[PDB]
Design an enzyme around this catalytic site. Structure first.
Site, mmCIF file in Angstrom:
data_model
loop_
_atom_site.group_PDB
_atom_site.id
_atom_site.type_symbol
_atom_site.label_atom_id
_atom_site.label_comp_id
_atom_site.label_asym_id
_atom_site.label_seq_id
_atom_site.Cartn_x
_atom_site.Cartn_y
_atom_site.Cartn_z
ATOM 1 N N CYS C 103 0.837 -1.202 0.000
ATOM 2 C CA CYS C 103 0.000 0.000 0.000
ATOM 3 C C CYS C 103 0.860 1.235 0.000
ATOM 4 O O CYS C 103 1.148 1.799 1.051
ATOM 5 C CB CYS C 103 -0.980 -0.007 1.166
HETATM 6 C C1 SRM Z 1 -3.780 -0.520 1.607
HETATM 7 C C2 SRM Z 1 -4.583 0.249 0.829
HETATM 8 N N1 SRM Z 1 -5.588 0.997 1.308
HETATM 9 FE FE1 SRM Z 1 -6.114 1.231 3.301
HETATM 10 N N2 SRM Z 1 -7.292 2.874 2.840
HETATM 11 C C3 SRM Z 1 -7.722 3.808 3.677
HETATM 12 C C4 SRM Z 1 -7.733 3.696 5.019
HETATM 13 C C5 SRM Z 1 -7.406 2.475 5.817
HETATM 14 C C6 SRM Z 1 -7.735 2.267 7.258
HETATM 15 C C7 SRM Z 1 -8.502 3.111 8.243
HETATM 16 C C8 SRM Z 1 -8.011 4.489 8.545
HETATM 17 O O1 SRM Z 1 -6.895 4.861 8.127
HETATM 18 O O2 SRM Z 1 -8.782 5.168 9.264
HETATM 19 C C9 SRM Z 1 -7.204 0.908 7.538
HETATM 20 C C10 SRM Z 1 -7.274 0.119 8.839
HETATM 21 C C11 SRM Z 1 -6.349 0.619 9.936
HETATM 22 C C12 SRM Z 1 -4.932 0.237 9.581
HETATM 23 O O3 SRM Z 1 -4.151 1.126 9.155
HETATM 24 O O4 SRM Z 1 -4.609 -0.961 9.714
HETATM 25 C C13 SRM Z 1 -6.582 0.532 6.237
HETATM 26 C C14 SRM Z 1 -5.954 -0.754 5.960
HETATM 27 C C15 SRM Z 1 -5.070 -1.141 4.856
HETATM 28 C C16 SRM Z 1 -4.202 -2.329 4.898
HETATM 29 C C17 SRM Z 1 -4.065 -3.306 6.032
HETATM 30 C C18 SRM Z 1 -2.870 -2.926 6.890
HETATM 31 C C19 SRM Z 1 -2.670 -3.941 8.008
HETATM 32 O O5 SRM Z 1 -3.334 -5.022 8.025
HETATM 33 O O6 SRM Z 1 -1.824 -3.642 8.881
HETATM 34 C C20 SRM Z 1 -3.498 -2.290 3.604
HETATM 35 C C21 SRM Z 1 -2.493 -3.313 3.128
HETATM 36 C C22 SRM Z 1 -1.055 -2.880 3.254
HETATM 37 O O7 SRM Z 1 -0.773 -1.886 3.935
HETATM 38 O O8 SRM Z 1 -0.190 -3.549 2.644
HETATM 39 C C23 SRM Z 1 -4.091 -1.075 2.954
HETATM 40 N N3 SRM Z 1 -4.968 -0.429 3.746
HETATM 41 N N4 SRM Z 1 -6.685 1.451 5.285
HETATM 42 C C24 SRM Z 1 -8.279 4.978 2.899
HETATM 43 C C25 SRM Z 1 -7.207 6.081 2.786
HETATM 44 C C26 SRM Z 1 -7.722 7.353 2.118
HETATM 45 C C27 SRM Z 1 -7.221 8.593 2.815
HETATM 46 O O9 SRM Z 1 -7.910 9.049 3.751
HETATM 47 O O10 SRM Z 1 -6.146 9.104 2.422
HETATM 48 C C28 SRM Z 1 -8.726 4.259 1.591
HETATM 49 C C29 SRM Z 1 -8.590 5.038 0.268
HETATM 50 C C30 SRM Z 1 -10.154 3.709 1.781
HETATM 51 C C31 SRM Z 1 -11.263 4.708 1.466
HETATM 52 O O11 SRM Z 1 -12.025 4.464 0.507
HETATM 53 O O12 SRM Z 1 -11.386 5.745 2.168
HETATM 54 C C32 SRM Z 1 -7.765 3.067 1.604
HETATM 55 C C33 SRM Z 1 -7.448 2.306 0.518
HETATM 56 C C34 SRM Z 1 -6.383 1.484 0.327
HETATM 57 C C35 SRM Z 1 -5.970 0.821 -0.993
HETATM 58 C C36 SRM Z 1 -6.256 1.450 -2.379
HETATM 59 C C37 SRM Z 1 -6.485 2.942 -2.472
HETATM 60 C C38 SRM Z 1 -7.055 3.389 -3.816
HETATM 61 O O13 SRM Z 1 -7.217 4.628 -3.938
HETATM 62 O O14 SRM Z 1 -7.337 2.575 -4.737
HETATM 63 C C39 SRM Z 1 -4.518 0.383 -0.702
HETATM 64 C C40 SRM Z 1 -3.528 1.514 -0.993
HETATM 65 C C41 SRM Z 1 -4.199 -0.905 -1.473
HETATM 66 C C42 SRM Z 1 -3.065 -0.724 -2.494
HETATM 67 O O15 SRM Z 1 -3.189 0.086 -3.440
HETATM 68 O O16 SRM Z 1 -2.015 -1.400 -2.387
#
Ligand code: SRM
Ligand code: SRM
Ligand code: SRM
Ligand code: SF4
Lengths: 385, 436, 104, 436, 385, 104
Positions: C103
C-alpha cells in the site's frame, strides 16, 4: 490544450512549496463556532437530522445533518456550497462518517433548511441530501474503493452501500433503534475503515487460491516478500520449468502454493502482481456483527463472523439487502435500550443471536487461527438449548 | 452516454443519493462544457469510468492493473497511481490516479475554499472526489501522470494546501470535531491533531518507517474518530477528578422535563425516563446511587465510560482536571490479527507545545524504527517483543492499568541481574550434590 | 511498451520501471534520469545504484530504507537531494529493480 | 531416631495435622515392630525418608534421581519408579517406588478393606500413602523393585483390586460422589465412571496413545471433581427441562425460616435472606422474577449455572429430563498453554450400556491416535487441527453452542467442493480479461 | 526375611490376575447411602464440619468432615478405621480435596463425633482430625509430591501446605468467607492438580536455565525430544568438543540453549536427565489467584499471576504464610456474598485487586506468550486511577 | 553399575538399561531377556529389536507405538505377547535404547 500551471519540468525544484500541511480549521469556522469553541455546555436532538448546542454564553448553534454518497462530483460539491452560501453564510462541515453538516443560528432556520434539503432530487428519484443520521437510528455506511479504483477488491463498495442504504433508508431519518447502528463495508480483508469494529459489517471475500503467472513472477515480484506475505505459510520458493507465451522453454524462480493451506486473504497479491485471485463466482461477501469503538458501559468489541458467504449479485445484491434488514429487524425488536448490537448478542448469547436473526451456522464461524482460537470456544456448561 | 450502462442503471433509483446519477451528471457537464474549461485529461473520463465499472459489474472482477508508482518530486507518497487493464476499450481512465489532499481537522470548510478546489480539480482531474477518505484526506479521484506536478503547483501556490500521506510513513492524522462543537472534548483535539501533523511533516511526506503509522485524536472515550481501532497511536480524552453534577437538572430529568440522551430515542416509545433503570443500573462499576432525590457518584470507582453523561448531558459534565490517555497498536488483520489500541499512557496533560506527548511519539518511533521488521506494524512489534518493551521505550514502569488481566500461563522471563547468583552454573557443582 | 535509447531496447511498464532485470544495460540509468529530475549521474548516485543492484542480486528483495541509509552512509535527506522522488520511485527505478508494491 | 531433623522438626507444631509427626510415628512403629511383621523393604525406610527430605530442606533442591522405569509384567504403567540420589547416605530410600492403586468411585471404604490393604503395604512397602492422588488413585508411597510383583500378586489374589494408570494411556477415571449423597446428581456419576474404567482396562494398563488421556465425571455443573480443568474428556451432568419449584419452601426462605445455601454462610452476619438480592439479581441470564410472592423462572433462558439451586436447595430441584455434556481438551500449560474443556456434545442421555458415550470416546480416540504427534494432548490436537475436526470426529455438525463467540479474524478456510467452479484455474483465462 | 506371596518369578504369567479394575463403590456404602442413593432431596450444613442430607424416604444422613494431610502412614489409616469402627459401623469416605468424611444417622451422634475427632492430637500438638471444610470457609489444600518423591519440583508440597494451613487454620472450622476459598499447590509447572484453576494457587517456580551435562546427554536423552520439549524454541541440536571427567577430549552430539530465550519451565529436564535445573536461591514460589471450576454465575476461570516471586524459606516459609493471609484478608473484607476470588477481582478490576491486597506489580505479570498475550492487555480507556 | 555377561561387559542403570548405545553388543539382548520374562529371542522379537535400533540410529528417538506397529506389523497385544513389560521397559531395553522419559 495542455495549460501550464507555472511549474517548470526543466527546473523541477525551483519555487517548489512543500511541507506546509493542512489548513488550520479556524480558517473555516462559522462565527458562532469560533466564538464559543471550548465553552459548550450541552446538546439536544431537536428532531431527526437536527442537533442543537448550548454554550456557556447562552449562544445556540443548530446543525442540520444530511446523507452523502462519499464518492462525489465537483458539481455536487458546488451544489453543497450553493446551499451553504444561501443558508449558512458560506460555512459547512463533513462528519467522520461522511455525512454533511450545515450550521445555522435558530431552530426555525434549521427547520426550513431540512425541508429544503429533503426536496432536492437527482434524476431517477434519489434524494440528493436526505436529512438524518442523528440519535438512535442508522447512519451512513463507512466504505472503501471497490471496483471504482482499487486492484485488490472482491466486491464493490459504492454499489453494496447504495443497495443497503436504499433497503434501510427509512431508518436514517428516524430514531427508533435501541442505539445508533453503525454499518461499515470493506471490499477485501485489508479492511480500510471500520469493518473490524462495527455493529454490522460487510466484507469482500475470496474463496479461491491465487492463479500463478509463473512467466512474470520473478520479473515483477520480490519473491521473499510474497513468501513472507502469507499469514499461514502456504507459500514457498521454488524453481520451475515452463513454456513462455512465445513457446520458448525455460526454468524460472517462482513460488508454489499448497492450495489446502490457503485461505484467500489476497495479501500475496498485494505484494506480487503475478498472484491475482479475483474470481466472479468465488468472490462474495462475509457479514460480521457486534463490534464497536465506544467505551460506553462495555469495552470496545471486535465484530464477529455471522454469515460465511453471500454471493455477489451486481447491480442490486438482493440477498445482501435481505440479510442486513433481517439482522437489523431482530436487533431492533429484541434489544434493550442503549444496547449496541454486540451488547445484545453477548447478553442473550450468540446461540440466541443466530436463532433470533434466523442465520445459519457452520464450520466457518469457528475460529481456527493460531493459539487464540482456543479462547473463542465454549469452556463452560453455561449455554442455552 | 458513451457506453451502455444497463447494470449500473439499476442504481439510479431508490432513495439514497445515487453515486451513479451523480457521476452521470458530471459526465454531462464535461460534455456540455459550458464554462469553457481547458480540460487537461480526457473529456470523457467519467464516461469511461462508468463503462469500466459496468464491465466489472458484468464480469464480477476489478479492471484496475496491479499497483502504480507515481508522485511529486520531493515527496515519497501522497498519490495512489492506477491504470485500467483495458486501456483500448476505456482510454479515458488509462491513467486514473488518486491524489490525497490534507484536510482541516474536524473537516470544517468555507465555500470559498471548496469552490477554489473544485475549479482546480475540474480543470486538472476528473471532477470526481471522495469526501472523505477513511484516514481523513480530501480524495481527488482520477488524473494523469503529467498533471500531478501541475495540480500540486496550483494546490500549494494558489491554495496554500499540502498533500496527505501514503506509503510506509506517518499518514494523515484525523480528529473528532473536539471542542469546536461538543461539550465533552477533554482537550482541543483539532489543535493537537494540526500541531502533530505540522511537527512531523517530514515523516509524512518521506517514508522513513518499517511500515505505515497513523495518529487519531478523540476528545473523549465516545471515540467519534474511532482512534482505538484505526490508529497505531490513539489519543483519547478523559478527566481524573469528579463528574460535575447539577442536582436541579437531575430533578428535571426525573420529572420528565428533559428527554434523556438529548432526545436520541424519541422515535420509539420506551416509557418515561427512569434514572434508576437507565443510569444507576447500567453504570458498569455500580458507582452511582440516588439519595434523597440527589444523584451521588463514587468517582474513584468511575472508569469514565461516558454512559451517564451521554444519557444526561444537561446535568452531568466532565471533570476539570483534564488530559488524555495514549493507546498503541491498533490495526486491521493482516498479518497477525486485528488489534485495537492497548493502554500505554493512562493520563497525560495536554499543553502547547506538547513536548511530553512528542516524547511518547518519538520514543515509540525510535524503538519501532530500529527493531521493526519490513511491513511489521507497531501492534505486531508489541506482540513480538512484548508490551513491557513498549512501556520501557516511553520511559514508564508497568502498572496494573497496563493490563485487563495478569497472565495465566506461567511462562515467565527473568532478567539475569534479577536472579540471585545469575546463570553461570557448572555441572560439576550440581553433580557434587546429586549422583547421576 | 518497448522503448529505444542510444540504440538499445528496453521493455518498460506505465511507470517506467524495467520489466526484466536480466535486460539491464548501463544505458538504463541514463534513459531514466530525465523523468526522475536528475541532470547527471554523480558518484553518489552510482554508489546507491550499485548497492541496490547488489542487494537485489543477493537477497531477491529491495533493502529497507534504514538498511540503505546505514549501508551507504547516505541519510534519508541526502537520498532525496540525489533522488528527488525518493529511494523507491527514483533510486530503485534507476537501478533497474522491480516496482515497489504493497500500500504505497 | 536415625537422623537429626532440625528443620523438619519445626513442622511438628501448629494446629494442622503434621505430616512430620505422622511419619515419625510410623518410623517408630517399624522400629518397635510390635506385631512381628517380616518387613520386606528396609525397616528404617521412613527414617531415611525424613533424612533425605531434611537434606532437601537444607540445600533447597530435590534428591530424587531423574525418572525410573519399573512395573509389573502385562502392564506398561501403574508404578512410578524413583531412586534417591544419595543411596549411601540414605540406603532406606535407595528404591522408593510409588504404586498407583485403583480406587472405588467416590472413595467410599469399609474398614475391612482399608485394614487389609494396610496389612499388605505395612509388610511390602514403606507404610506411607497418599489418600488420594490428584487423578484419584490410592497412592502407596515407597517400595523396592523385587516387591512390586509380590504386592501385585497379593493385591489381585487376596484383595481383588487392580493397579491404576500412568504413562501414555488412559489414566484412572474419577468422579464426584454423584447420587450416593447429593440431590443434584444428574446421572449416576459413580456408575458411569466405574463402567468406563472397566470397559477400557486395556487402554489403561497398556499405553497405546500419543500421550496421556483422562476421564472425569461431574454429576452437575458445580464440578466437585473438577473435570472441566483436569480431564481430556469431561462429562458434566445437566437437565434440559424446567427447574422444579416448591413455592411453599420459597415462602419459607423469604420468611426467614430456612437459612440460604444450606447455612453455608452462617459464620458471618450478611443480614436476613433477600431473595431479590441473592438470587434474582445474580442469575446470570436475568431469567427469574418474583410475581405475587411466587418465584418464576423462564427456563428457556436458564443456562443451568446452579446458583439459585445452590442458594435454595430446599425449594429448587434439577429437572426430570437428565443427561450430560461432554467437553474436550483440558490440560495443564505444557506445551502450548493451559486449557479447560471445550463444549463438544451439549446433551446426551446416560443409559447402560452407554453405547452413545462409548461412540464419542472412541471417535475422539480414533482421530487422536492417528493424528496426534508424540506427546501432543488432545487439546493441543484440537488447537492444531481445529474444533471443527473434533466435531466431525464424533459425527456431529457444528452448532452455535460449540463456541462462546464466532471468530473475528476472517482467515476462513473453504473446502474446494463447497466453492463453485473449484480451484483449477489457468492464468491464460485470467489474462484474456485483464491486461498485464 | 524375603517372604514369597506365591508369585513365581520363574513362571511370571501363570496365575496372573489382571484387567480387573477398581472395586465397585457399592461394596462399601453405609446402609443409609445404599438405601437412598438417587433419591436425595436436600441438604443443609448443621455447623462447621457437619453436613446433613434428607432423602425422599425421610431418611437423614449426617456427615462429619475433618482435615487430612493427604500424605499419611498406615498407622494413621488404622486410626481412621478405629474411629469408623467405633462410630460409623466401619464405613467412611475421602473427598476430592482429601478431607475425611464419617457418616452417622443422627445430629447428636454427629456432634459427639465432631467433639471426639477435635480432641485427637499428634505429639507436638497438631490436630489429628480437625473438623471443618464445609460451607463458606477455607478448605483443604490440593497439592503434589514436592521433595517427598518427585524429581522435577522447585519447592516442597507437604511443607508449604502445612505452613499455609497453620496460618489459616481458624478458617477451616468456620464459615466467614464470601464463598468457600479453594487454595491449591503444585511444585513445578506441570501443575499436577488444580493450580491453574483455584481461588489462590501456589506454584514452585525456577529462575535459571538448565545446567547441561554434555558428557551424558546423547547417551541418556533422545535429543530431538528435548529440542521439541521447549515451548519457546530455545533449544537446538549441536556438536561440541568436551573434556570428560576422565580427562578424554572427544566431540559429542548435545544441545545448546540460548539463555536469554529460556523461561525455566523445566520441560526439557522432564525429557532429558542431562538437563537438570533445580537451584537453591533461584527456585521459589509464584502466587496466582482468581481461578475456579464451577459454572455458578460466572464461567470457569483461569488463575492469574499476582506475585512474581516469593523465595523458598524451608521449613516455615514465613513470607508465603504472610502473603496468602494478606490476600485472604483483603478478599474476606471486601468481596460480596457468593463472590469467588476471581469474581471479586474481575468486578473491582485487577488494578483494585493489587491495591486492595497491597501486592506489587511488575513486568512479570504482563502476558508475553504468543498471539494470545495481546487479549490480556487493556483495549479500553475503562480503567480506575 | 558394570556387569559381565559371557566375557563381554556393559554399563547399566538401576533399571537395567544400557547407559551407552555405542557400547552395544549381540550379547546385550541375551543378558536382558531373563529379567524381561523371555525364554528365547525368536525371529519376531528380533524384527522388533532391529527396527527399534535402526529407528534410533536414523532419527535419534524411539518410535511412537503407532509407528512401531505400522512399521513391523505387530499390534500392541502381540508386542505384549512377545515382550511382557511392553515396548518401553521390554523391547526398548532389550534393543539397547535409552530409558523412556516423561510422565511415565
Ligand atoms: C492498503 C490500501 N488501502 Fe487502506 N485505505 C484507507 C484507510 C485504511 C484504514 C482506516 C483508517 O486509516 O482510518 C485501515 C485500517 C487501519 C490500519 O491502518 O490498519 C486501512 C488498511 C489497509 C491495509 C491493512 C494494513 C494492516 O493489516 O496492517 C493495507 C495493506 C497494506 O498496507 O499492505 C491497505 N490499507 N486502510 C483509505 C485512505 C484514504 C485517505 O484518507 O487518504 C482508503 C482510500 C479507503 C477509502 O475508501 O477511504 C484506503 C485504501 C487502500 C488501498 C487502495 C487505495 C485506492 O485509492 O485505490 C490500498 C492503498 C491498497 C493498495 O493500493 O495497495
Ligand atoms: C507428570 C507427572 N505427574 Fe502429574 N500427577 C498427578 C496428577 C496430575 C493432574 C491432575 C489430575 O489428573 O486430576 C494434572 C493436570 C491435568 C493434566 O493432565 O494436564 C497433571 C499434570 C502433569 C503434566 C503436565 C501434562 C501436560 O502439560 O499436558 C506432567 C508432565 C508430562 O506429562 O510430561 C505430569 N503431570 N498431573 C498425580 C497422579 C496420582 C494419581 O495416580 O492419582 C500426582 C502423583 C500428583 C499428586 O501428588 O497427587 C502427579 C505427579 C506427577 C509426577 C510423578 C510424581 C511421583 O514422583 O510420583 C510425574 C509422573 C512426573 C514424572 O515422573 O515425570
Ligand atoms: C458529528 C460526529 C463527530 C465528527 O464528525 O467529528 C459526532 C457527533 C456526535 N457524537 Fe459521535 N459523532 C460522530 C462519530 C462517532 C463515531 C465514529 C463512527 O461511527 O465511525 C462513534 C463510534 C461508533 C462506535 O461506538 O463504534 C461515535 C460514538 C458516539 C457515542 C457512543 C456510542 C453510542 O451510541 O453509545 C455517543 C454518545 C451518545 O450518542 O449518546 C456519541 C455522541 C455524539 C454527540 C452527541 C457529541 C456531542 O455532544 O456533540 C454528537 C451528536 C450525535 C448524534 O448525531 O446523535 N458519539 N460517534 C460524527 C457523526 C457521524 C455521522 O455522520 O453519523
Ligand atoms: S458435582 Fe454436582 S452432583 Fe457431584 S457432588 Fe458436586 S454438586 Fe453433587
Amino acid at each position: 490544450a495542455f495549460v501550464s500551471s507555472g511549474y517548470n519540468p526543466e527546473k523541477p525544484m525551483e519555487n517548489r512549496i512543500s511541507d506546509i500541511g493542512p489548513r488550520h480549521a479556524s480558517d473555516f469556522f462559522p462565527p458562532v463556532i469560533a466564538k464559543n469553541k471550548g465553552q459548550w455546555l450541552w446538546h439536544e436532538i431537536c428532531e431527526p437530522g437536527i442537533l442543537m448546542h448550548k454554550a456557556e454564553s447562552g449562544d445556540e448553534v443548530y446543525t442540520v445533518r444530511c446523507g452523502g454518497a462519499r464518492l462525489m462530483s465537483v458539481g455536487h460539491i458546488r451544489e453543497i456550497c450553493a446551499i451553504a452560501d444561501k443558508f449558512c453564510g458560506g460555512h459547512l462541515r463533513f462528519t467522520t462518517r461522511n455525512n454533511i453538516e450545515f450550521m445555522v443560528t435558530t431552530l426555525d432556520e434549521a427547520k426550513k433548511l431540512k425541508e429544503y434539503l429533503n426536496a432536492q432530487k437527482f434524476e431517477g428519484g434519489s434524494f440528493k441530501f436526505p436529512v438524518g443520521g442523528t440519535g438512535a437510528g442508522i447512519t451512513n455506511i463507512v466504505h472503501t474503493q471497490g471496483w471504482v479504483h482499487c486492484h485488490t477488491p472482491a466486491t464493490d463498495a459504492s454499489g453494496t452501500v447504495k443497495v443497503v442504504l436504499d433497503e434501510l433508508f427509512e431508518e436514517f431519518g428516524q430514531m427508533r433503534m435501541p442505539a445508533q447502528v453503525r454499518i461499515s463495508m470493506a471490499c477485501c480483508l485489508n479492511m480500510c475503515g471500520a469493518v473490524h469494529c462495527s455493529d454490522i459489517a460487510i466484507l469482500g471475500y475470496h474463496r479461491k487460491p491465487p492463479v500463478i503467472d509463473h512467466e512474470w513472477l520473478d520479473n515483477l515480484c520480490e519473491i521473499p516478500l510474497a513468501v513472507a506475505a502469507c499469514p499461514v505459510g502456504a507459500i514457498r520458493p521454488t524453481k520451475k520449468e515452463i513454456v513462455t507465451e512465445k513457446g520458448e522453454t525455460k526454468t524460472v524462480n517462482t513460488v508454489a502454493i499448497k492450495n489446502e493451506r490457503c485461505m484467500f486473504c489476497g495479501n500475496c497479491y498485494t505484494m506480487c502482481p503475478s498472484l491475482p485471485l479475483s474470481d466472479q463466482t468465488g468472490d462474495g461477501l462475509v457479514i460480521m456483527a457486534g463490534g464497536k469503538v465506544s467505551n460506553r458501559i462495555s469495552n470496545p468489541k471486535f465484530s464477529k463472523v455471522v454469515v460465511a458467504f453471500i454471493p455477489n449479485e451486481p447491480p442490486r445484491w438482493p440477498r445482501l439487502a435481505s440479510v442486513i434488514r433481517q439482522i437489523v429487524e431482530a436487533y431492533a425488536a429484541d434489544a434493550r435500550k442503549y444496547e449496541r448490537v454486540g451488547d445484545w448478542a453477548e447478553r442473550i448469547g450468540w446461540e440466541r443471536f443466530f436463532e433470533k436473526c434466523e442465520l445459519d451456522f457452520s464450520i466457518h464461524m469457528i475460529d481456527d487461527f493460531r493459539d487464540p482460537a482456543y479462547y473463542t470456544w465454549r469452556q463452560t456448561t453455561n449455554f442455552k438449548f | 452516454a458513451k457506453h451502455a450502462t444497463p447494470l449500473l442503471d439499476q442504481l439510479q433509483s431508490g432513495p439514497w443519493p445515487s453515486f451513479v446519477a451523480d457521476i452521470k451528471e458530471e459526465a454531462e457537464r464535461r460534455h456540455s462544457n459550458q464554462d469553457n474549461v481547458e480540460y487537461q485529461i480526457p473529456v470523457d473520463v467519467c464516461d469511461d469510468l462508468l463503462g469500466i465499472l459496468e464491465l466489472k459489474y458484468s464480469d464480477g472482477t476489478t479492471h484496475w492493473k496491479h499497483g502504480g508508482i507515481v508522485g511529486v518530486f520531493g515527496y515519497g507518497g501522497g498519490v495512489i497511481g492506477r491504470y485500467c487493464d483495458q486501456p483500448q476499450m476505456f482510454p479515458g481512465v488509462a491513467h486514473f490516479h488518486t491524489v490525497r489532499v490534507a484536510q482541516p481537522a474536524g473537516m470544517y470548510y468555507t465555500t470559498d475554499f471548496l469552490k477554489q478546489l473544485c475549479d482546480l480539480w475540474d480543470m486538472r482531474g476528473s471532477g470526481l472526489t471522495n469526501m472523505h477518505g477513511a484516514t481523513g484526506d480530501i480524495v481527488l479521484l482520477g488524473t494523469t501522470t503529467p498533471q500531478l506536478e501541475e495540480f500540486y503547483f496550483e494546490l500549494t501556490h494558489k491554495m496554500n494546501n499540502d498533500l496527505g500521506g501514503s506509503g510506509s510513513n506517518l499518514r494523515t492524522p484525523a480528529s473528532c470535531l473536539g471542542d469546536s462543537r461538543c461539550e465533552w472534548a477533554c482537550y482541543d483535539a483539532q489543535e493537537l491533531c494540526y500541531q502533530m501533523t505540522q511537527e512531523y511533516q517530514d515523516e509524512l511526506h518521506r517514508p522513513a518507517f518499517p511500515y505505515k503509522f497513523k495518529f487519531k485524536f478523540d476528545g473523549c472515550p465516545n471515540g467519534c474518530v474511532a482512534s482505538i481501532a484505526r490508529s497505531d497511536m490513539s489519543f483519547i480524552g478523559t478527566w481524573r477528578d469528579d463528574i460535575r453534577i447539577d442536582q436541579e437538572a437531575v430533578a428535571a430529568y426525573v420529572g420528565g422535563e428533559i428527554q434523556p440522551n438529548g432526545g436520541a430515542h424519541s422515535g420509539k416509545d420506551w416509557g418515561a425516563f427512569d434514572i434508576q433503570k437507565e443510569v444507576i443500573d447500567l453504570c458498569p462499576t455500580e458507582c452511582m446511587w440516588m439519595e434523597d432525590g440527589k444523584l451521588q457518584i463514587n468517582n474513584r470507582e468511575c472508569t469514565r465510560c461516558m454512559h451517564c453523561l451521554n444519557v444526561m448531558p444537561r446535568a452531568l459534565r466532565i471533570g476539570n482536571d483534564r488530559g488524555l490517555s495514549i493507546l498503541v497498536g491498533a490495526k486491521a488483520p493482516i498479518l497477525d490479527g486485528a488489534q485495537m489500541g492497548s493502554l500505554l499512557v493512562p493520563f497525560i496533560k495536554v499543553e502547547d507545545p506538547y513536548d511530553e506527548i512528542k516524547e511518547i511519539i518519538e520514543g515509540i518511533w525510535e524503538w519501532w524504527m530500529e527493531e521493526g521488521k519490513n511491513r511489521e506494524r507497531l501492534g505486531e512489534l508489541i506482540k513480538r517483543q512484548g508490551l513491557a518493551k513498549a512501556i520501557a521505550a516511553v520511559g514508564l514502569t508497568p502498572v496494573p492499568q497496563h493490563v485487563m488481566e495478569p497472565r495465566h500461563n506461567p511462562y515467565i522471563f527473568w532478567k539475569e541481574k534479577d536472579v540471585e547468583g545469575g546463570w553461570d552454573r557448572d555441572i560439576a557443582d550440581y553433580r557434587k550434590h546429586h549422583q547421576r | 511498451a518497448m522503448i529505444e535509447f542510444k540504440g538499445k531496447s528496453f521493455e518498460i511498464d506505465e511507470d517506467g520501471f524495467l520489466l526484466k532485470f536480466e535486460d539491464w544495460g548501463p544505458e538504463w540509468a541514463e534513459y531514466v534520469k530525465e523523468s526522475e529530475g536528475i541532470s547527471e549521474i554523480t558518484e553518489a548516485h552510482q554508489q546507491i545504484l550499485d548497492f541496490l543492484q547488489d542487494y537485489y542480486k543477493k537477497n531477491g528483495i529491495a533493502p529497507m530504507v534504514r538498511i540503505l541509509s546505514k549501508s551507504t552512509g547516505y541519510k534519508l535527506k541526502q537520498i532525496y537531494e540525489l533522488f528527488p522522488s525518493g529511494p523507491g520511485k527514483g533510486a530503485c527505478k534507476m537501478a533497474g529493480l522491480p516496482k515497489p508494491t504493497g500500500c504505497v
